[PDB]
Pyridinium-3,5-biscarboxylic acid mononucleotide sulfurtransferase (Lactobacillus plantarum), 1438 residues
Amino acid sequence: ATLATKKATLVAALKDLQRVTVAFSGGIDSTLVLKMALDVLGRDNVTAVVANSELFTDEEFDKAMSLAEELGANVQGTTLDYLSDDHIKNNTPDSWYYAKKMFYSRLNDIAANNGSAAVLDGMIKNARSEAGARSLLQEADFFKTDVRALAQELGLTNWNKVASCSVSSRFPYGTTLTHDNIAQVMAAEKYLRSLGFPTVRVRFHNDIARIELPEARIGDFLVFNDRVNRQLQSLGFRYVTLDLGGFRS
Amino acid sequence: KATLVAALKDLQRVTVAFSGGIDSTLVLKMALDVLGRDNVTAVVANSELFTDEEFDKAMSLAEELGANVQGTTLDYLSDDHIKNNTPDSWYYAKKMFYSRLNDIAANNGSAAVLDGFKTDVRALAQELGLTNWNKVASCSVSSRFPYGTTLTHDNIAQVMAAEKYLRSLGFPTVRVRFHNDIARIELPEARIGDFLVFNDRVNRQLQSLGFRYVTLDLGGF
Amino acid sequence: TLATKKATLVAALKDLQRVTVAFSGGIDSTLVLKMALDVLGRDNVTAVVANSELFTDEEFDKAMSLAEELGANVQGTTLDYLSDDHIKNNTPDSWYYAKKMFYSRLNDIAANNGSAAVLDGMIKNRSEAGARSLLQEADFFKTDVRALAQELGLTNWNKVASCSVSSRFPYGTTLTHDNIAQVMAAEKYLRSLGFPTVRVRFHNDIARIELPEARIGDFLVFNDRVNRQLQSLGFRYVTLDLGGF
Amino acid sequence: TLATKKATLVAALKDLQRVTVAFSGGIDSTLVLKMALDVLGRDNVTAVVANSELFTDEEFDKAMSLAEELGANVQGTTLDYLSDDHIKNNTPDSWYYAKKMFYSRLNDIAANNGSALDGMIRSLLQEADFFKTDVRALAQELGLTNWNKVASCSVSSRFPYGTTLTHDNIAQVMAAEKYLRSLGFPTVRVRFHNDIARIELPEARIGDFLVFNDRVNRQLQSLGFRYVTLDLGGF
Amino acid sequence: TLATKKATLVAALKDLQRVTVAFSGGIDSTLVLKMALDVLGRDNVTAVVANSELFTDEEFDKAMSLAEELGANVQGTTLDYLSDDHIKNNTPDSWYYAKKMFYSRLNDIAANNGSAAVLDGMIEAGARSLLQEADFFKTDVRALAQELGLTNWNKVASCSVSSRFPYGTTLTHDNIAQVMAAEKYLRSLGFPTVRVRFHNDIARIELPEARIGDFLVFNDRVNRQLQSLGFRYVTLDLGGF
Amino acid sequence: TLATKKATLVAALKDLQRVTVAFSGGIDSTLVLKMALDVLGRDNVTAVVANSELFTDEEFDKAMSLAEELGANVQGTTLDYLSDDHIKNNTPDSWYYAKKMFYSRLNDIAANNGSAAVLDGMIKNKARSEAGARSLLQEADFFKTDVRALAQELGLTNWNKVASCSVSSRFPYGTTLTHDNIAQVMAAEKYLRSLGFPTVRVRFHNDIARIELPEARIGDFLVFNDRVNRQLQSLGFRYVTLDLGGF
Ligand SMILES: [Cs+]
Ligand SMILES: [Cs+]
Ligand SMILES: [Cs+]
Ligand SMILES: [Cs+]
Ligand SMILES: [Cs+]
Ligand SMILES: [Cs+]
């Protein structure tokens, strides 16, 4: 339960694996996994993969790609067409399962080709598990607090402090995702973020946009009312609203 | 004042469409004062598209002036143009309204039904003026529903309860626009700042009335 | 039946011949004072307005002028509410011990000028003092009060009623001249900033300010000024109740 | 005593026999105009309204309609305050030369109709001991209901002492206040500081102003101001 | 001059031979515990962490965990501060008599474990502040902390819960729980610096004035929560924190 | 490549043997001072932080402590920027004459330290080069990402993430800088900073102070309205205003 033996667990596991492929998201957990992998195995035996997809922002992709380079890993992007699976295109409740399946199926193809012994992700002990992958922080009982601590011990400083999550969550179940509406939602959230709100949602309800913000920031939002209204109207919405129960999940 | 009083003497017996406003109160009192309690019949309309406070306040308000008051109820929702909320709904409603007042007038015996310049009106008001006004004007609840939407007994009650709640918080000028699972709240932009302490309570309150998401329009009115 | 009620009221006044009216400034006592004046004449009506440590000087001056404007001969009287321990110690029965002291003074006043009874504005919604509510004996229903006032031209009364300052103190807490002055000064300040509906609840070294919730947002710009002022008025801590009014 | 002062006003008016009233549209000028009418009769009282380059056209018209509705024969007059250099150059006594020019014209009109009065609290109200609270009482007692709940001061107050007033800056200032008024702020001043607009609001209203920040910034910038600011001490 | 400062610390430690440390979890106690461990070894160092009713269980656990991570022999003990009448009735002397109970227990621990002194972290009970004797400034502590690799201390300061009560009000287990439950709630809304001041039936909240604007959306929710926790009135102090 | 960029830099430091560092507190000067310390040792590196009337005391003290904590012998020095007529007269040239005066002092310090060069923290993208000082990161092709790359590798985790311009930006170009108005502007911003607004400008318009804040922070300012008004009025301003178009 000491942070040191947690680290020791992580190091011996990697030494056993010898060659790894890292599912690199750009967050703190992914950064700790990629950083520790390089520190134990060296740049030649680690491959960082970043997924380019229509369900996450281009900025998240671009900074993650550079973040891996700053960590000293040979990084490789790969593009995933999530909308090619009908459960995702039609935004059923099982969408998450087919997305992760399509994602881990792609990473195992990559690892199988560069000879790697495992795919690595940044699951930590916090209902999620994925058999064809090794979550070494979860496996060594790394808690959110242990990740921040080991990250500071190593000097890792520059990750992406906000998770942002898949855009399918901005559409109701049963709604079909298209390039236009996804682009419509992404343009809206990019705007609200540029005003200073890193945690933001623009939920799609056809002609109504419903914005979720953290309740503690709603007071500060008032100065942007008219600008958000006119801008989100340029993107296709007729009504621009603010959900009074703020940012739920 | 000279012309209006002479016009009243000519009609002798009248029925007044009483709204509670500046015009309706002044005409009803002058009609009562010129034609007498025995010759004036005041009617105030009760309907599913306006709140009971407008109705109940109007019946008690006119009695205070000393006129005999008569309520009548109108099933606007029996007209398909209103039930289906076409843009022409206003016209069929007013048509349905005056045909009811003309039936009433014919049976009571009135010569006419009276309705409600403003600068000349404000002056004649000063001669007496009275209190227990109805200083706020009403609007039909049809405006809270889009044109394609069919009006039901439940959603009208739903929207009216929501506005009645928001009014009680201290926001007399408000609209709760109906979009099925979404409530869209219109407030005057100068009041949106003052609304913030009530956010969570309005959310849980309007949700218990049937709404799934409770929202506030960034453009106010 | 409105005329029927007014006639009853008139028959009561004419019969009594001389009256003293506890004039509050409100619509009801104003209507009573107007009808009393109209039925018996200025010389046979004495309107009394009570001055006490439990209400503001502004409130007293306002009632005194409202009686003067109707054309009534008006007389102020000062009451030492704090001499009775039931008020001084602010028990929950304080409301009645205050009203008992009030009607007894009205009977002393009435007894010396010659009035047949004391008049107040109680309404069909005191007995121990021979006080009569002519509006309530004739089933005036608040709607009739607004009605007879319009008939008579009564247009200008005291639109907001005055609560006693004892409501600013918790039960059992003893009132001193300074506590009352502290509280009233605090509310006079807060009203002057633009908050006509306000309370400064007294909790010894704590001030607890009650506002209409919709006005708290506007209140923020005055926190430090209000804090320093109510602190200079005797409070050590100045707080704002999260549950408003 | 509220009637003892009414008697003073009525006694003074009968003595004057014929009157000319400087009617501003406010509570005080309204009370005088009504009393002159009822004590002296419509034929012996003339209400004069001053129009000038220093007050709003809306302010003039609201006064004109109220005087007629009170039943007075009312007469408009225009004053070119900008022709006196003390007014145009806004030195500190500019108020005195404007008021002098105003009463000199009001004395002119009155002599020609034949009258032998203003709303200060000659000011027949400030003689009978009216202290603003007495004025509202006589206003309620008399049935007066409609006047200007917001007091209109001359726009020369928006410029620092020494600034010369032009039609352009005056219009600029009046356009800005007219804009801010339409947003829900009836009490407002836009102080002119060349390229800087300094906006005074009642402190109780500053909280509500935030939703309009960017709109007024771009609007007052379009009227000629470069920087649009809000005075922290407000009105 | 910094390298001579470390030397004073090393000599003072070597002279003592066996030590017990009052470990707070902060940077100073971390530096003292780490250097004692580095000079004397785990077998000659005892880290003491106190559990008491005036500080949180969360804070207790974090000091316990920080001490284990440095590799120290750690000894928790509980202190019943409310058995001293100065603390229970919260006179103004409470702070000093509380510290006396604390240093008496640690010196009792030190006498039985075998240590020469009780060490604490400060830049009449035999306690010794070695960073002080050697003249460490806050600037010098952060410097030696990085020289050693320390990154993980307790960045949050901790006041005793006696500060939430006025002098003369007596502290009980129940009102203390009430005050701490309230502050933890407010912290969970997002206000890390907060006090819930106890005035019997009145709750008085001190906040950073810059966050009072942001607080309004929680007004009614805080009212009902702290009312449910025992308060009758929930108030906000206008002069902030 | 980065392994061999560190290499060029470490080789360059060994050649100079003794150095003086222009320490700003930012990541770039932090990387250089840290590498000089790691390659040449504490005895051979002298960190200099400049105090002046055009920058805050907070920025000065924060840089001094960052160098102390990094393990460098740190030495403050003060510059009288207002003695140069180009700086006092707030022309568009002022920045250059300031940097000339600044590097001129670093060279005197260096001559007394015994150092072979003056090092600054400039990276690949006249005052610096007229004085002969050297940007060692520029010389190994360090780009912003290579600075961040190496900062993690050395453990550098604590630098000064906020940049800070000279006070002359609070004055229009025609205005000549005086000690009294500089004190006026700086006291005000230090005041506003203490209220909880780290990003602030007090623009000087003679009798008018015009305050720039982030729009997202204007809402929070309300409880401080009357105190900021009276405080800046006590500092010499007649009117204290807030720009509606923020920062
Ligand atoms: Cs797994
Ligand atoms: Cs109804
Ligand atoms: Cs009094
Ligand atoms: Cs004009
Ligand atoms: Cs505990
Ligand atoms: Cs300085």
